[PDB]
């Protein structure tokens, strides 16, 4: 009917621990640090990013730029049409990763702390590498309903399935912009698996590490993908009374299908 | 040639038969080829020959009353039904919808055309009720078909006909477009609770047109402008990106050809 | 900073694969890219591709998409490129290089490797027959008497020739080889004064690495 | 996707004279370009690493600049060691080389001859017979060689090659070799090498008697 002409939307970039992609202290000189910072509620240019049509991400005329093409170098703010033309190129995948195309190295927040400088690290699809461009800052607070129409309920350090209650403590989850799934009681805790192995009962640990085992993606087929190891959320032997939520290869049975009910 | 028929009954209604029904209905609405941001889109509506344009969904309550619905594959909306000798079709907005609808029920004694559209507004106006007071679930669907089948005999109340259509479109069409609505009916079937929809479902049904727009001209997944949605308690949150919406929308209407 | 070193020359059967190596040393091996450049006659230089050791990412010139395959062994601090289905167009000198730093204003080419010659030919190796050449007599005199060696009948391409193990560098003209109808031959001329004609020992040292054979040769005056 | 057409394909220049090579990219490389000197028999060498910044240890006579897509490169006080092929490389989008430019330098000199070498005793016990004729350190490079075996003009079965230009004197050399059989070699006594040049009032000739 036409060509899907695309816009350049001004946006903030929320990532690890809900902290925005921010230009440090507002100064825009070539080489200043792109840091992590609490998401401002105003029109300060040092947090507002135009997703330009040429796969470049600009805040106030200057480009989100990697210093180099090696794991470890930091991401700075630089004059677009002065620096290397592909040190400013980025893509934003549907799974959350924002990636430079020269080397697969991905925008990451190596620490979950404020004032932390952004870098580019080798892509392990981790919590410290998941990003989401939005102007909505707060995470997504919903309930997660799975097999047999029962709820996902984090108790203290255990995730299990228990029939849904309108306000029970606690089955209300916050889907963060870094791919983590956090019980709203303690926002410092993530849906975490200790591997990178198959069965691996999923637990609830602190998001401090921001590891590849705490980042997830709600896929189109109703599964919740680990984004690493290619494993989804599985109810072990389809038995809720076991209180065992596990990782397992995608098979598509009701023990792997989920729907977020807000 | 003949169109694809997808059957379903509301007597042995199990959440597995409802889930399987909406799945097989999905398998004919889209080739599955055109997929954007992991959300499949429906065909072009341009260059679809008459033998690729529609699918059929056959219903049975019990009683023995059978009703076969007709879905415009280009948008997966119900366009008409059949009750034996008779067949009825909504008012087509333009030509090539008026002569394509001719090829739906060729086998009837004869077919009749309404003077109103299938849009919820002209459908609520004729129903004397809004969607949030028209109950949905296994119960109302068994009641919508008996009112639909009995229209060929004429012994059906017209508001209960518009009340029946809204039940039929929501639990089939909107349940196909969104997995979220597919669950909200699967949830009701699981507990035998006839219930009117949440405001969270109503907002999605209106927005399916707009959502399919912003998701496809999004440039990386980031909308040009936000879309306001509602919660189980009518709320204010706005969506700025697709990744959150991926597990909610399963079908989108074709908007424009993708970047070459 | 220090160094990169590659493998010796290679001869392959047309339609096979050969894996050139590039041994890196002196710098933190994992955090720097390794480059590859082809050089065949008349074609000058052309960028093949790059591989980053330690994380296995790649970037290929599209002309070599399917020809090249970069690999890096984290154990022995090395990088390998492999050319598949070698025709005669793949016969060239292949270089490996590094950037200077992490980029991007650095990360221009520095720290090259000495290059590796791949010769694609059906023929098999043949050690060289080295013939000396004194002026004979053919008297003659004077100022500076010239001589050299005749490295005829070898294959494949690379041979290094010296007098005497490298000590006689000023006055040597080692000529480019020529493919004998199907073999390789060349000559190398060194002029030296006429007083060091019998006083000195004009030994030419011809080394063939592809046959693993080496030949030293005194140039003793003919009659 | 960034092509770089270099100019010129090659050139000759008088000693001490300035030369100019230009590179032009399909799009803007944002002043990210380097210049490389491929000395014969040696690996590549970097001279100018940012568009104008000179690499250390490079003479002050090497210069280069540019803006956007157009780029210049100028050797000013030319010297016999500057014989090489020069390339342009950009590192903005990726590494893309130019076609290269081959530099030749000029002199005026005549060729000393070999003096022609008869075939060795080791070769003669192997049926072969090869007679070598170096034409050594001359310029122009355009010269001709001939062989007279006992007065007639020997045409077939002669091989030769030319050296790269010399980095010291800017003079070329040529090594001609006539190969016959041990039979054919012994059925003659005079093998002569006829060298004809531009800077030669008469041809220079070196021969031998068996
Ligand atoms: C997220 O929030 C920011 C600020 O709250 C929004 O940025 C604003 O976007 C609008 C429309 O894109 C800009 O208005 C336009 O400005 C141009 C400038 O010439 C003018 O020609 C237009 O007629 C219109 O007035 C506004 O300047 C801009 N404000 C900023 C950047 O501080 C942003 O659009 C929001 N994004 C989404 C997806 O809602
Ligand atoms: C995270 O999301 C991105 C979204 O694109 C995924 O990267 C891409 O994944 C697709 C498959 O889903 C790859 O497609 C392949 O493309 C090549 C070249 O066009 C083709 O030859 C193959 O047959 C295949 O179709 C694609 O290479 C890959 N990368 C890019 C840059 O598009 C990524 O895999 C996702 N990761 C996870 C763990 O889900
Ligand atoms: C809906 O009910 C119909 C009842 O007959 C199915 O059609 C028939 O199904 C037979 C196998 O169950 C198959 O041999 C027949 O060819 C087919 N068609 C007719 C005219 O009898 C129908 O099955 C679908 O439609 C036809 C065209 C076949 O291709 C089937 O493979 C299809 O699944 C039923 N559809 C569903 C989704 O259950
Ligand atoms: Cl179920
Ligand atoms: Cl340009
Ligand atoms: Cl003979």
Domain limits, chain D: 4-105, 121-209
E strand or H helix that includes residue D104: strand D101-105
Among protein residues, the one with the nearest Cα to ligand 2's atom 29 is A93
- Which chain C residue has its CA at the smallest distance from D192's CA? C138
Query: What ligand 2 atom has the least distance to the C-alpha of A91?
Result: 31
Instruction: Report helix, strand or coil for B10.
Output: coil
Among protein residues, the one with the nearest Cα to ligand 1's atom 14 is A10
Whether B137 and B39 share a structural domain? yes
Q: Is B231 one of the catalytic residues?
A: no
**Spatial distance between the Cα atoms of D54 and B199, rounded to a whole number of angstroms:** 70
Q: Is A53 annotated as a binding residue?
A: no
DSSP string for residues in B153-172: TT-S-HHHHHHHHHHHHIII
Cβ contacts of residue C171 below 8 Å, gap of 6+?
C144, C190, C191, C192
State whether C57 and A103 contact (CB < 8 Å): yes
Cα–Cα distances (Å) from C93 to A216, B196, C114, in that order, read 48, 76, 10
Reported resolution, Å:
3.3
DSSP string for residues in B33-102: --EETTEEB---SSS--GGGSEEEEEEE-SSS-EEEEEEETTTTEEEEEE-SS-EEEPPPSSTTSTTTGG
**Spatial distance between the Cα atoms of A26 and A116, rounded to a whole number of angstroms:** 15
Q: Which domains does chain A have, with CATH numbers?
A: 1-138 (2.80.10.50), 139-262 (2.80.10.50)
Question: In this structure, which CATH number among 3.40.600.10, 3.10.20.740, 3.30.930.10, 2.60.40.10 belongs to the domain D121-209?
Answer: 2.60.40.10
Among protein residues, the one with the nearest Cα to ligand 1's atom 4 is A43
State whether C107 and A72 contact (CB < 8 Å): no
Cβ contacts of residue A43 below 8 Å, gap of 6+?
none
Q: Which domains does chain C have, with CATH numbers?
A: 3-120 (2.60.40.10), 129-218 (2.60.40.10)
CA of B45 to the centre of ligand 3 (A): 26
E strand or H helix that includes residue B27: helix B15-29
Please name the residue that has the structure tokens 């491929």.
Answer: D38
Whether B120 and B184 share a structural domain? no
Render the burial of A45-58: b for 16+ CB within 10 Å, e for the rest: bbbbbbbeeebbbb
E strand or H helix that includes residue B176: helix B175-177
* Phi, psi for residue A3 in degrees, rounded to 5: -100, 135
Nearest in space to D133 (alpha carbons), one of D205, D81, D67: D205
Angle (CA) B152 B157 B163, round 5°: 100
Q: Is there a contact between C200 and C192 (Cβ–Cβ < 8 Å)?
A: yes
Whether B169 and B204 share a structural domain? no
C90 burial level (CB within 10 Å; 0-12, 13-18, 19+): buried
Whether B116 and B185 share a structural domain? no
Same CATH topology for D4-105 and D121-209? yes
**Residues paired with residue D5 on neighbouring β-strands, in sequence order:** D24
Q: Do chains A and C touch (3 or more CB pairs under 8 A)?
A: yes
Cβ contacts of residue D125 below 8 Å, gap of 6+?
none
Please state the separation of Cα D91 from the chain's center in Å: 30
For residue B192, what are the domain limits? 177-260
Could you tell me the sign of the dihedral formed by the alpha carbons of C168, C170, C175, C177, in that order?
A: positive
DSSP string for residues in B213-234: HHHHS-TTTEEEEEEE---SS-
**Spatial distance between the Cα atoms of C38 and C41, rounded to a whole number of angstroms:** 10
Please, how many CA atoms are within 13 Å of residue B137, restricted to the half-sphere of its CB?
Answer: 16
Instruction: Report helix, strand or coil for C68.
Output: strand
Ligand 1 touching residue A257 (CB < 6 A): no
**Spatial distance between the Cα atoms of A79 and A88, rounded to a whole number of angstroms:** 9
Ligand 1 touching residue A41 (CB < 6 A): no
Cα-Cα-Cα-Cα torsion D161, D167, D171, D172, nearest 10 degrees, comes to: 0
Instruction: Report helix, strand or coil for A100.
Output: coil
State whether B222 and A260 contact (CB < 8 Å): no
Whether B6 and B85 share a structural domain? yes
- Which chain B residue has its CA at the smallest distance from A224's CA? B247
Expt. technique: X-ray
Q: Is B180 one of the catalytic residues?
A: no
- Residue C7 carries which DSSP code? -
Cα–Cα distances (Å) from B202 to B18, B133, B194, B234, in that order, read 20, 11, 16, 10
Tokens of B193: 């609770």
Query: What ligand 1 atom has the least distance to the C-alpha of A135?
Result: 1
**Residues paired with residue A173 on neighbouring β-strands, in sequence order:** A142, A183
**Residues paired with residue A218 on neighbouring β-strands, in sequence order:** A224
Tokens of D74: 């100028």
Choose, out of B184, B241, B255, B258, the residue to mutate when testing the contact with A (most A CBs < 10 Å): B241
**How many other CB atoms are found less than 10 A from the CB of residue B23?**
13
Long-range CB contacts for residues C86-89, cutoff 8 Å, separation at least 24: C86/C12, C86/C14, C86/C15, C86/C16, C86/C17, C86/C18, C86/C118, C86/C120, C87/C14, C87/C15, C87/C120, C88/C14, C88/C120, C88/C121, C89/C40
Among protein residues, the one with the nearest Cα to ligand 3's atom 37 is B6
Nearest in space to A150 (alpha carbons), one of A121, A129, A171, A119: A171
Please, how many CA atoms are within 13 Å of residue C78, restricted to the half-sphere of its CB?
Answer: 13
Whether B227 and B170 share a structural domain? no
CA of D180 to the centre of ligand 6 (A): 8
State whether B219 and A51 contact (CB < 8 Å): yes
Last residue of a domain, one of B157, B176, B195: B176
Cβ contacts of residue A235 below 8 Å, gap of 6+?
A146, A147, A161, A244, A245, A246, A255, A256
| D4-105: CATH class | mainly beta
Render the burial of D16-25: b for 16+ CB within 10 Å, e for the rest: eeebbbbbbb
- Length of chain B, please? 260
Ligand 1 touching residue B226 (CB < 6 A): yes
Whether B148 and B203 share a structural domain? no
Q: Is B120 one of the catalytic residues?
A: yes
Whether B171 and B188 share a structural domain? no
Instruction: Report helix, strand or coil for C177.
Output: coil
* Helix-, strand-, coil-residue percentages of chain C, each rounded to 5: 5, 50, 50
Query: Which A-chain residues 125-144 have CB contacts (< 8 A) with chain B?
Result: 132-136, 140
Whether B235 and B165 share a structural domain? no
Instruction: Report helix, strand or coil for B212.
Output: helix
Please name the residue that has the structure tokens 């919590």.
Answer: A127
Last residue of a domain, one of B148, B176, B204: B176
Cβ contacts of residue D189 below 8 Å, gap of 6+?
D150, D209, D210
Q: Is A172 annotated as a binding residue?
A: no
Whether B192 and B81 share a structural domain? no
- Which chain D residue has its CA at the smallest distance from A103's CA? D94
Domain containing residue B197: CATH number: 4.10.470.10
**Spatial distance between the Cα atoms of D106 and D14, rounded to a whole number of angstroms:** 6
Q: Is there a contact between B56 and B3 (Cβ–Cβ < 8 Å)?
A: yes
State whether C175 and D161 contact (CB < 8 Å): yes
Distance from CA of C108 to the nearest CA of A (A): 12
Ligand 3 touching residue B24 (CB < 6 A): yes
Residues of A in contact with D91 (CB under 8 A): 84
Tokens of C182: 């199907």
Q: Is there a contact between D185 and D95 (Cβ–Cβ < 8 Å)?
A: no
C143 burial level (CB within 10 Å; 0-12, 13-18, 19+): exposed
**Spatial distance between the Cα atoms of C52 and C98, rounded to a whole number of angstroms:** 10
Please, how many CA atoms are within 13 Å of residue B96, restricted to the half-sphere of its CB?
Answer: 7
């Amino acid at each position: 009917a036409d060509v899907c002409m695309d816009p350049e939307p001004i946006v903030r970039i929320v990532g690890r621990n809900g902290l925005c992609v921010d230009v440090r202290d507002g100064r825009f000189h070539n080489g200043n640090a792109i840091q992590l910072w609490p998401c401002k509620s105003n029109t300060d240019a040092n947090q507002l990013w135009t997703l330009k049509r040429d796969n470049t991400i600009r805040s106030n005329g200057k480009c989100l730029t990697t210093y180099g093409y090696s794991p470890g170098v930091y991401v700075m703010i630089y004059d677009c049409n002065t620096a290397a033309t592909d040190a400013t190129r980025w893509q934003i995948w549907d799974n959350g990763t924002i990636i430079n195309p020269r080397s697969s190295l991905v925008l990451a927040a190596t620490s979950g702390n404020s004032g932390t400088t952004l870098t580019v690290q080798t892509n392990i699809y981790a919590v410290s590498q998941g990003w989401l461009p939005t102007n909505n800052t707060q995470p997504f607070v919903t309930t997660i309903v799975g097999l047999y129409g029962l709820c996902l309920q984090a108790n203290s350090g255990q995730v299990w399935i228990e029939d849904c209650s309108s306000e029970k403590a606690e089955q209300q989850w916050a889907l963060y912009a870094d791919g983590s799934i956090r019980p709203q009681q303690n926002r410092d805790n993530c849906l975490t698996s200790d591997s990178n192995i198959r069965e691996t009962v999923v637990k609830i640990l602190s998001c401090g590490p921001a590891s590849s085992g705490q980042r997830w993606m709600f896929k189109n087929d109703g599964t919740i993908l680990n984004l690493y190891s290619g494993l989804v959320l599985d109810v072990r032997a389809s038995d809720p009374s076991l209180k065992q939520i596990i990782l397992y290869p995608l098979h598509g049975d009701p023990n792997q299908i989920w729907l977020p009910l807000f | 040639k003949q169109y694809p028929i997808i059957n379903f009954t509301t007597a042995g209604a199990t959440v597995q038969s409802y889930t399987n029904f909406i799945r097989a209905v999905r398998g004919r609405l889209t080739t599955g080829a055109d997929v954007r941001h992991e959300i499949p889109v429906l065909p072009n509506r341009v260059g679809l020959p008459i033998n690729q344009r529609f699918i059929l969904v056959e219903l049975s309550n019990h009683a023995e009353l059978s009703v076969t619905l007709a879905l415009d594959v280009t948008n997966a909306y119900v366009v008409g039904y059949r009750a034996g000798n008779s067949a009825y079709f909504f008012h087509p907005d333009n030509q090539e919808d008026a002569e394509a609808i001719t090829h739906l029920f060729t086998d009837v004694q004869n077919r009749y055309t309404f003077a109103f559209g299938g849009n919820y507004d002209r459908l609520e106006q004729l129903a004397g009720n809004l969607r949030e007071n028209i109950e949905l679930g296994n119960g109302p669907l068994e009641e919508a078909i008996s009112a639909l089948y009995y229209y060929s005999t004429g012994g059906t109340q017209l508001p209960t006909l518009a009340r029946s259509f809204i039940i039929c479109i929501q639990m089939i069409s909107e349940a196909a477009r969104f997995q979220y609505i597919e669950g909200e009916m699967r949830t009701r079937i699981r507990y035998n609770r006839r219930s009117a929809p949440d405001p969270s479902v109503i907002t999605l049904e209106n927005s399916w047109g707009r959502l399919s727009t912003a998701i496809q001209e999004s440039n990386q997944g980031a909308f040009a402008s936000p879309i306001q949605l509602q919660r189980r308690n009518g709320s204010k949150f706005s969506v700025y990106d697709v990744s959150i919406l991926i597990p909610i929308i399963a079908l989108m209407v074709y908007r424009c050809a993708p970047p070459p | 900073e220090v160094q990169l070193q590659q493998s010796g020359a290679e001869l392959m059967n047309p339609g096979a694969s050969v894996k050139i190596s590039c041994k890196t040393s002196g710098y933190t091996f994992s955090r720097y890219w390794i480059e590859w450049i082809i050089q065949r006659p008349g074609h000058g230089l052309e960028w093949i591709g790059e591989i980053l050791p330690g994380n296995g990412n790649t970037n290929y010139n599209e002309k070599f998409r399917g020809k090249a395959t970069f690999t890096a062994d984290s154990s022995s601090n090395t990088v390998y490129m492999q050319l598949s289905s070698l025709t005669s167009e793949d016969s060239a000198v292949y270089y490996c290089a590094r950037p200077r730093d992490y980029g991007f204003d650095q990360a221009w080419f520095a720290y090259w490797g000495q290059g590796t010659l791949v010769t694609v030919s059906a023929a098999k190796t043949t050690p060289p027959s080295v013939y000396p050449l004194a002026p004979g007599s053919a008297a003659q005199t004077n100022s500076m008497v010239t001589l050299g060696c005749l490295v005829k009948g070898y294959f494949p391409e690379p041979v290094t020739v010296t007098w005497n193990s490298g000590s006689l560098s000023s006055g040597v003209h080692t000529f480019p080889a020529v493919l004998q109808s199907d073999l390789y031959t060349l000559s190398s001329s060194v002029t030296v004064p006429s007083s060091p004609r019998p006083s000195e020992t004009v030994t030419c040292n011809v080394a063939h690495p592809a046959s693993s054979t080496k030949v030293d040769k005194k140039i003793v005056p003919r009659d | 996707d960034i092509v770089m057409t270099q100019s010129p394909s090659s050139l000759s220049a008088s000693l001490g004279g300035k030369v100019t090579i230009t590179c032009k990219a399909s799009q803007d490389i944002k002043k990210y370009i380097a210049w490389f000197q491929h000395r014969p028999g040696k690996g590549p060498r970097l001279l100018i690493h940012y568009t104008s910044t000179l690499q250390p240890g490079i003479p002050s006579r090497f210069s280069g600049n540019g803006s956007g897509r157009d780029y210049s490169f100028s050797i000013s006080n030319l010297e016999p060691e500057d014989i090489a092929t020069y390339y342009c490389l950009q590192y903005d989008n990726l590494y893309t080389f130019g076609g290269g430019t081959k530099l030749e330098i000029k002199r005026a000199d005549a060729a000393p001859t070999v003096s022609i070498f008869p075939p060795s005793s080791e070769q003669l016990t192997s049926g072969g017979a090869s007679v070598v004729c170096f034409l050594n350190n001359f310029y122009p490079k355009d010269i001709n060689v001939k062989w007279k075996i006992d007065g007639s003009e020997r045409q077939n079965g002669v091989l030769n090659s030319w050296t790269d230009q010399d980095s010291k004197d800017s003079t070329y050399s040529m090594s001609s070799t006539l190969t016959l059989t041990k039979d054919e070699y012994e059925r003659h006594n005079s093998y002569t090498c006829e060298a004809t040049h531009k800077t030669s009032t008469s041809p220079i000739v070196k021969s031998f008697n068996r």
